[PDB]
Amino acid sequence: KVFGRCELAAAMKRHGLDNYRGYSLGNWVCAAKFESNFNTQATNRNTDGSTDYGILQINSRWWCNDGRTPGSRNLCNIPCSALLSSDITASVNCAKKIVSDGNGMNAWVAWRNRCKGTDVQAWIRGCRL
């Protein structure tokens, strides 16, 4: 499933990401854009044996278990497969855990390089209206 910008914005808002841990909604939209291009099925293999899953590219080394990543911690307590659903709930719930547990949104590389430092509110511009 490929979401639309405002479509994702609304869904994320419903799930309580707006200003969660201090990060306004635009942050999350921008992250999804650059991490997955709004695609719920995206996956990416890493040199360390881990894989990044779904719309928010959640990593299998720390966060979810994919049954094939060495040194798996499963801090979200979910199978990575659940993160490939067209429904974003699992991804959002795990994302909150990630951000609450440390480095904030720095866990997302695309966020840090391509979102942070720009006017992220522009990402939710024109969505309600």
Kindly report the CATH number assigned to the domain that includes residue 85.
1.10.530.10
- Domain residues for the domain of 50 are 2-129
Exposed / middle / buried, residue 54 (Cβ in 10 Å: 0-12, 13-18, 19+):
buried
Count of domains for the chain: 1
Is residue 18 part of the annotated active site? The answer reads no
Exposed / middle / buried, residue 75 (Cβ in 10 Å: 0-12, 13-18, 19+):
middle
Ligand-binding site membership of 101 (annotated): yes
DSSP single-letter state for residue 32: H
Per the CB < 8 A criterion, the answer to whether 8 and 1 are in contact is no
Is residue 7 part of the annotated active site? The answer reads no
Of residues 48, 52, 66, 87, which has the active-site annotation?
52
Query: What is the CB neighbour count within 10 angstroms for residue 21?
Result: 12
- Which technique was used to obtain these atomic coordinates? X-ray
Query: Who contacts 19 (Cβ-Cβ below 8 Å, separation ≥6)?
Result: 25
Per the CB < 8 A criterion, the answer to whether 63 and 98 are in contact is yes
